[PDB]
Amino acid sequence: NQSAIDVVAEKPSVRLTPTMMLYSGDGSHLLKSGRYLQQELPVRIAHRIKGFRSLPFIIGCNPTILHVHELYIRAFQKLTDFPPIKDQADEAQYCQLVRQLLDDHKDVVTLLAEGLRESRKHIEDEKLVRYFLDKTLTSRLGIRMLATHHLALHEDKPDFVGIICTRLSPKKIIEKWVDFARRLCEHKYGNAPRVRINGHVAARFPFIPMPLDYILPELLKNAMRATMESHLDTPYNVPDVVITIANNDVDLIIRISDRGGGIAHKDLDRVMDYHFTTAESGPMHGFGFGLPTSRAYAEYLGGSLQLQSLQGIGTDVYLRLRHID
Amino acid sequence: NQSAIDVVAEKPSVRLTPTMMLYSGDGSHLLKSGRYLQQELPVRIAHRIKGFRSLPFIIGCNPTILHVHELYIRAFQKLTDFPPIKDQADEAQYCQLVRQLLDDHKDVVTLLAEGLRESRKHIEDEKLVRYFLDKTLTSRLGIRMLATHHLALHEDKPDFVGIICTRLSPKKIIEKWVDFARRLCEHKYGNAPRVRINGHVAARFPFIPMPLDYILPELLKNAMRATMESHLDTPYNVPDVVITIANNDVDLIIRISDRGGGIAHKDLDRVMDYHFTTAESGPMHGFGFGLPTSRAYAEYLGGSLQLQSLQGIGTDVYLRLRHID
Ligand SMILES: Nc1ncnc2c1ncn2[C@@H]1O[C@H](COP(=O)(O)OP(=O)(O)O)[C@@H](O)[C@H]1O
Ligand SMILES: Nc1ncnc2c1ncn2[C@@H]1O[C@H](COP(=O)(O)OP(=O)(O)O)[C@@H](O)[C@H]1O
Ligand SMILES: Cc1ccc(-c2ccccc2-c2nnn[nH]2)cc1
Ligand SMILES: Cc1ccc(-c2ccccc2-c2nnn[nH]2)cc1
Ligand SMILES: Cc1ccc(-c2ccccc2-c2nnn[nH]2)cc1
Ligand SMILES: Cc1ccc(-c2ccccc2-c2nnn[nH]2)cc1
Ligand SMILES: [K+]
Ligand SMILES: [K+]
C-alpha cells in the first residue's frame, strides 16, 4: 500500500487532557493547538487504516469493508496534502477541510456494520466484531472530539470552552433527552412512563456533553420501551422510570431504574453484543448498537456502563463518568 | 500425622442435591441418608485438616491455628470411631455425637480469625487469608447443612422437609430480620430507618432459610448503620431503606437500596476483605466479616452478592440465590 501511511501507523497517539484544554481557553494559543491538530489527525486516520490492514483477508475483501478502507486512505491523503499552517488564513481553509472530513462520511459506522454483517459466515469469533467495532467507535469519537473542540474554540458560546461545558447540569441534559424520548414513546404506544429525577439534582461541573448526547437517549429509549412492552395490557397505567444523580469528587453516577421486567437470563450474556436486539449520522441508534456503543463510550471517557437485572421486575443501569479534574 | 486422615483427604465430597433431599421426605429412607452422612462427615473434616496441613509452616505453627487444627483431628477420630450404623438405636447415639460436633466448637471461626490476625506480619498476601477463610466458612456451612438436615428429618415441623422450607416467603424472612435490626438500631441511635419492601411480595417457593439467617441481618445492619451515620445531624428524620424482591424461574433477587452516602472510592476494593470495617456462634457478625462471609455463602449456594456504590447518595446491594428446582 502507501508508505506515508506506514510511517505513522505505529506512532502513539498524543491526547490533550480535558484539564489542559480548559487551561488554554484566543490568538497565540490557537496556533499551538492548530499545529498539534495537524500532526495528530493523520495519525488517528493511519491507526484506523492499520485496523483494516490487520483484518483477516476474507473480511478485508468485503466490497463494503474495502470501500470504507478506501475512504480512510483518501482522508489521510487530504490531511497530509495540506502544508504546515503558518497564518490563520490557511487555518480557515483547513477548518473547511476538517468540516468536510467531519461532514462527508458520517455514515462510515453504518457501512462497516453492513460489511461485517455480509461477512458473518467467515467470522468464527463474535469477539472479533466487538473488538473491531469498539475500536472503530472509540477512535471515531476521539477524532470527532479532537476536531469539534478545535473548531468550537473559534466561537464565543456562553458556558463553553470549545466542546467543554464549564457548568454542565446532569439534571438539565437528562431532562432534554427525557422530553425527546417521551414524545417518541407517546407516538409508538399512545403513552410514555413519567421520568422522575432525584439525588444531586443541583450538581453543575465542567464536562463534555457530546457522548452523553448519544448515551442518554439510548438508555432512556431502552428503559421506556422495556416499561411499555411489559405493561401492554395496561398501556395508560405504567410505572415511572427513576433516575438518580450521584455527584462526588471522583465521578458522576447516573442510575436509570425501570420496572420493565428485566433483561432475561437467556439474553444477559448477549445484550452487550453489537446487533443483539429483541426490538422489531455517526454512531447509530437501533439495530442492537445501543448498549455496546454506550459502554465503549463510557469506558473511553474513564468510566463504565453496568447493568443489574432483576428478572420479573426491572433493570438498573449505572452510567459512571470520570470528572474532568 | 495420622494415616486414616490421609486415606480421605483427597477423596471428592459427595453432595445430595436439595431436589434429591425433598424427594426423600421416614424409616427406610433415613437409613440410606444415615449411611451416607456417616461416609461423608469424616471426608469433610479430612478436607479441613488438609487445609491446615497446606498452610505455610510459619502460619500453621500459630498456637491458636494449631489448636483449631487439633480440634479437627479429634473430631475426625470421634466420627470414624463409630461402627457402621445397623439399627436406629445407634443412630440416636450418633445424633448425640453429631449434636456434640455441632455444639462443642461453634467458635472455631472466631479462633481462626484470632490466629490469622496474630500471624499477619508473616502473611504477605491478603489473598491467602480470603482464600483460607472463604474455604473455612463455606465448608463449615456445608457440614452444618449436611448434619442439621439429617437431624431435622427426625422432626415433623410444618412446611419443612429437614432444613428445607417447602414454602418460604422472602417477604416474611426479611420482615423478621427488619424487626430485629430496627430494635438494635433504635437502641444505638434513638431511631432507625423505616424499611419498605416491594416487588414480588407474595412469592413463596422451596428454599433453605439457614444462610439467609446470617446474610439478611448483616446487610440490614450495614444499610441501617450507613443511613444513621450519614444523617447524624437529623437523626429523627432519615431516608427509608428500600428492599425489592424479584422472583423468576432461575433465581431469587433481593435488592437492598439505602441512602447511606455510599461506599467511598478509597474503600471499595477493601470492603470485601475479612476484617475491613469503618465501624467502631459459627460465622461471626462484626469485625469486617459481614460482606466477605455473605458473598462466600451466596456463591456456595449458586448465587452471588454484588454491590453498586453511588458515592454521595447510597448503595444498592444485590443478593442473588439460585432456585432449588
Ligand atoms: N432496561 C432494559 N430492560 C429490558 N431489556 C433491556 C433494557 N435495556 C436493554 N434491554 C435489552 O437489550 C437489548 C439490546 O439493547 P440495545 O443494545 O440498546 O439495542 P436496541 O435498543 O437497538 O434493541 C434490547 O433489545 C433489550 O432486549
Ligand atoms: N450499605 C453500605 N453503605 C455504606 N458503607 C457500607 C455499606 N455496607 C458496607 N459498608 C462498608 O463496608 C464495610 C465492611 O462491611 P462488613 O463486611 O459488613 O463489616 P462490618 O459490618 O463489621 O463493618 C463497613 O464497615 C462499611 O464501611
Ligand atoms: C480519554 C480521553 C477522552 C477525551 C479526550 C478529549 C477531550 C476533549 C477534546 C478532545 C479529546 C481527545 N483528543 N484526542 N482524543 N480525544 C481526551 C482523552
Ligand atoms: C472520521 C470521522 C469521525 C467522526 C465523524 C463524526 C462527525 C459528526 C458526528 C458524528 C461522527 C461520528 N462519530 N462516530 N462516527 N462518526 C466524522 C468523521
Ligand atoms: C452447593 C450446595 C449447597 C447446599 C447443599 C445442601 C443443601 C441441604 C442440605 C445439605 C446440603 C449439603 N450437603 N453437603 N454439603 N451441603 C448442597 C449443595
Ligand atoms: C464443624 C462445624 C461446622 C459448623 C458448626 C455450626 C453449628 C451451628 C451453628 C453454626 C455453625 C458454624 N457455621 N460456621 N462455622 N460454624 C459447628 C461445627
Ligand atoms: K445490543
Ligand atoms: K469487610
3-state secondary structure chain B: CCHHHHHHCCCCCCCCCHHHHHHHCCCHHHHHHHHHHHHHHHHHHHHHHHHHHHCCHHHHCCHHHHHHHHHHHHHHHHHHHCCCCCCHHHHHHHHHHHHHHHHHCCCHHHHHHHHHHHCHHHCCCHHHHHHHHHHHHHHHHHHHHHHHHHHHCCCCCCCEECCEEEEECHHHHHHHHHHHHHHHHHHHHCCCCCEEEEECCCCCEEECCHHHHHHHHHHHHHHHHHHHHHCCCCCCCCCCEEEEEEECCCEEEEEEECCCCCCCCCCCCCCCCCCCCCCCCCCCCCCCCHHHHHHHHHHHCCCEEEEEEECCCEEEEEEEEECCC
Instruction: Mark yes or no for CB contact B310/A246 under 8 Å.
Output: yes
Same domain, B9 and B29: yes
Q: What is the CATH number of the domain that holds B262?
A: 3.30.565.10
Distance in angstroms (rounded) separating the CA atoms of residues B103 and B99: 6
Residue B249: Cβ within 10 Å count = 10
| A230 Cβ closer than 6 Å to some ligand 1 atom | no
What grid cell was written down for A37? 491538530
Distance in angstroms (rounded) separating the CA atoms of residues A315 and B305: 16
List the single residue in B248, B306, B312 with the smallest CB-CB distance to A311. B248
Please give the C-alpha separations between residue A140 and each of A41, A219, A229, A244, in angstroms, as whole numbers: 11, 21, 33, 30
For ligand 5, which residues put their CB under 6 angstroms from it?
B 15-16, 18, 21, 142, 145-146, 149, 163, 208, 300-301
Q: What is the DSSP letter of A157?
A: -
Instruction: Mark yes or no for CB contact B246/A311 under 8 Å.
Output: yes
CB neighbour list of residue B136: distance below 8 Å, 6 or more residues apart: B48, B51, B108, B109, B112
Tell whether B203 lies on the interface with A, counting CB pairs under 8 A.
no
Distance in angstroms (rounded) separating the CA atoms of residues B133 and B72: 15
| A15 Cβ closer than 6 Å to some ligand 3 atom | yes
Same domain, A136 and A216: no
Same domain, A109 and A189: no
Same domain, B157 and B180: no
CB A211 within 8 A of CB A166: no
| A44 Cβ closer than 6 Å to some ligand 4 atom | no
Same domain, A113 and A196: no
C-alpha distance from A166 to closest chain B C-alpha (Å): 22
For ligand 2, which residues put their CB under 6 angstroms from it?
B 218, 222-223, 226, 258, 260, 263, 267, 271, 276-279, 286-288, 290-291, 315
Confirm whether residue B148 is marked as ligand binding: no
> Which of A263, A313, A317, A319 to probe by mutation at the B interface, max B CB count within 10 Å?
A313
| A181 Cβ closer than 6 Å to some ligand 1 atom | no
Tell whether B316 lies on the interface with A, counting CB pairs under 8 A.
yes
Same domain, B288 and B171: yes
Which of B104, B126, B161 represents a domain boundary (last residue)? B161
* Residues of chain A positioned with their CB less than 8 A from the CB of B197: none
Same domain, A110 and A202: no
Same domain, A40 and A156: yes
* Residues of chain A positioned with their CB less than 8 A from the CB of B205: none
Instruction: Mark yes or no for CB contact B244/A310 under 8 Å.
Output: yes
Tell whether B308 lies on the interface with A, counting CB pairs under 8 A.
yes
Q: A147 C-alpha vs ligand 3 centroid, how far in Å?
A: 10
Please give the C-alpha separations between residue B209 and each of B146, B149, B176, B253, B321, in angstroms, as whole numbers: 14, 12, 12, 15, 11
Q: From which experimental method does this structure derive?
A: X-ray
Structural domain range at position A253 = 164-322
- CA B116 from centroid of its chain's CA atoms: 19
- The total domain count for chain A is 2
Which of A161, A187, A207 represents a domain boundary (last residue)? A161
Residue B27: Cβ within 10 Å count = 6
Distance in angstroms (rounded) separating the CA atoms of residues A320 and A301: 9
Same domain, A151 and A175: no
Distance in angstroms (rounded) separating the CA atoms of residues A8 and A5: 6
Same domain, A311 and A218: yes
Same domain, A151 and A235: no
| Cα angle B262, A265, B303; round to 5 | 55
List the single residue in A251, A308, A312 with the smallest CB-CB distance to B248. A312
What grid cell was written down for B35? 449411611
What grid cell was written down for B240? 427509608
Tell whether A60 lies on the interface with B, counting CB pairs under 8 A.
no
Residue B136: Cβ within 10 Å count = 21
Tell whether B267 lies on the interface with A, counting CB pairs under 8 A.
no
Going across the sheet that includes A304-310, the strands are A195-199, A241-247, A251-257, A314-322, A304-310
Tell me which H or E stretch contains A126.
helix A126-152
Q: A145 C-alpha vs ligand 3 centroid, how far in Å?
A: 6
Which of B141, B161, B181 represents a domain boundary (last residue)? B161
> Which of A244, A304, A311 to probe by mutation at the B interface, max B CB count within 10 Å?
A311
Instruction: Give the CB-side neighbour count of residue A281, counting CA atoms within 13 A.
Output: 10
Same domain, B117 and B66: yes
Distance in angstroms (rounded) separating the CA atoms of residues B131 and B56: 13
Out of B13, B146, B299, B321, give the residue to mutate to test ligand 5, the one with the largest number of ligand atoms within 8 Å of its CB. B146
CB neighbour list of residue A41: distance below 8 Å, 6 or more residues apart: A79, A98, A101, A143, A146, A147
Tell whether A268 lies on the interface with B, counting CB pairs under 8 A.
no
